[PDB]
Amino acid sequence: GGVQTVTLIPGDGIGPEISAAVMKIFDAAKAPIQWEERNVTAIQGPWMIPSEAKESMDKNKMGLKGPLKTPIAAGHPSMNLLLRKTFDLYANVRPCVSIEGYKTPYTDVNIVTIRENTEGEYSGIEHVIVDGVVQSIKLITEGASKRIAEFAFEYARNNHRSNVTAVHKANIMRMSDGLFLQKCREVAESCKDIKFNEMYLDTVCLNMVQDPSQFDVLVMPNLYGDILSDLCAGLIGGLGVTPSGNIGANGVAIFESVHGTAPDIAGKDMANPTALLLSAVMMLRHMGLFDHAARIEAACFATIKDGKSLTKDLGGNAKCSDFTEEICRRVKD
Amino acid sequence: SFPVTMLPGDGVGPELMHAVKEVFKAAAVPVEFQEHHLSKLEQVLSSMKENKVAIIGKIASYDMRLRRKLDLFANVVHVKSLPGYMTRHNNLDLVIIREQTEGEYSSLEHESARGVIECLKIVTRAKSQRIAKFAFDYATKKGRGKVTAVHKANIMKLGDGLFLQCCEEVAELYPKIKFETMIIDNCCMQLVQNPYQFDVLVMPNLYGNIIDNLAAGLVGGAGVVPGESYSAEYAVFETGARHPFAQAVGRNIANPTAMLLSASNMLRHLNLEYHSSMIADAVKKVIKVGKVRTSDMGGYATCHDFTEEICRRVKDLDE
């Protein structure tokens, strides 16, 4: 009931191709979405992202972001760092599910890694104490830890998920990770409809590679999230087929592809939009267009099990457009 | 001859050490174990001063103190598939070299305001240049061809960049070994997708924790991956993935494979090549024939049953 505007950041490289392919798949299923292309490439006035990009994301809360090219300048900061602080992106969510057409040594994987995005070892605080002695400061606070453990039990109930696991190393970093655990438990007792437990980062790592089936929703501090999420990516096929969203403050969210900009195949009709598509599916669900999302999702999955059209990186000769149009065909059920 | 210090340790440690001496007495091994049932107890440093090698179970914290009282700065974990035991990744062969005395492991934590905890992570050029020369000496001593340095220098520009910088500097002195760098989270994902691109890996403490257990689970898990920790005078042998709930559950259920395997490494270090090759090959052959397998490997055998079979094969003469 009403047509919405998503800020679309096409990005670099195969960026615009996959963006414009997702726009076409949304069109096909007549999904209530206008797009508003913006550019997040940073400038610095009196460091920041363009004003038009901020006013856009602030007005319409949703974004869809393709792969950005890694800047060249030493002094140029990380683009995700500028994105995070601008909109207070505090929860990075990664649902990792095996794709049925794409065979991997792991077959039964269905995991969601909620990752605290604001602090941890990414505090940005380092000091050179003396010559050849550096000191990086890991920061854990009670506010932020609580915020993330609340999101994770929400996500777990909203997306009808049954277990949440707090992953820490509180045996080593007794005070920092201890506080994180302390608040996770605090939230877990006020949401007793979800079986909550704890594990050690190294116990989860050793178990993930042997049997991912036992895991569900996982919530963890920043560094642990960064490692674990890419680790689980490899369980299902890699950054090319994994969605990603960063929930932030003021209803803002940006859903993103985490895969590379891939310039060697820019222009040529060979990119894969599966990753950017499944992220925009997340966006739809986060917006409450649940049937448009379950539909689009069903099509893309059906296309990949057929095998008829796969791009170069899933074992096909099919072009980016032959893949896209098969989905669009499929989504008019 | 040959005195060796033995710390049986927390958890099933006592039961693995019982298996070790049982196979040792089986293979008639010239090694007498001088053991301390720990947990100052700096009696340990005295015995290592005379003995110079140890076999240890699972034990700033004691572990990171004892390491520091022994200057066990380098940790080596051998990730190598065993032929009989099948996994999603077979025929794998990696070396994980890990710094042990720095990073987040020294309890440098404090409260700057109510509910704001700071925790310090220390990287120094001293300890990094050292672990970096040790990794390249390991690559040359052993015939390995590549040393990949794992870091997150894009976020921790100083510090993880200091560690990186020492690796590149050390790497010029060894022009016969190839040197690559990779980012920890990228490395973890490549380790599940394709771990065969790696030869030797070198990383600071916390990343080494992660990649020790992650690789360990590639080739069979906490019961079969062995590991050493070296000083410049000392050699301590343990298990490779030594995480908190590693083998602590169960009684007469644990896998002695990793402990035996590094015990045979200890024998190789002691220059007892004959007994090292025997015990190792016995263990490896009980696993290949697949007669007896412990629960973590998919079988029904007790720890005693597995060890019994290792002895039956060290003693066999028709081999």
Residue numbers in the entry:
A (entry chain B): 2 to 47, 51 to 337
B (entry chain C): 14 to 52, 62 to 81, 92 to 351
Please quote the paper that reports this structure:
Crystals of the αβ heterodimer with the α subunit in apo form (αβ) grew at condition I and belong to space group C2, and the structure was determined at 3.06 Å resolution with each asymmetric unit containing eight αβ molecules, which form four dimers of heterodimers via the clasp domains. In this structure, there is no metal ion or ligand bound at the active site. In the αβ and αCaβ structures, most residues of the two subunits are well-defined except the β2-α2 loop (residues 52–60) and the β3-α3 loop (residues 80–93) of the β subunit and a few residues at the N and C termini of the α and β subunits. In the αβ structure, the key residues at the pseudo-allosteric site, the heterodimer interface, and the active site assume similar conformations and form hydrogen-bonding interactions comparable with those in the αCaβ structure, indicating that the αβ structure also exhibits an active overall conformation (data not shown). Similarly, in the αβ structure, Asp-230A, Asp-234A, and Asp-217B assume positions comparable with those in the αCaβ structure and are not in proper positions or conformations to bind the metal ion effectively. Structural analyses suggest that the active overall conformation of the αβ and αCaβ structures could be attributed to the changes of some residues at the pseudo-allosteric site and a unique hydrogen-bonding network, which stabilize the side chain of Tyr-137B and the β5B-β6B loop in the active conformations and further trigger the conformational changes of the heterodimer interface and the active site.
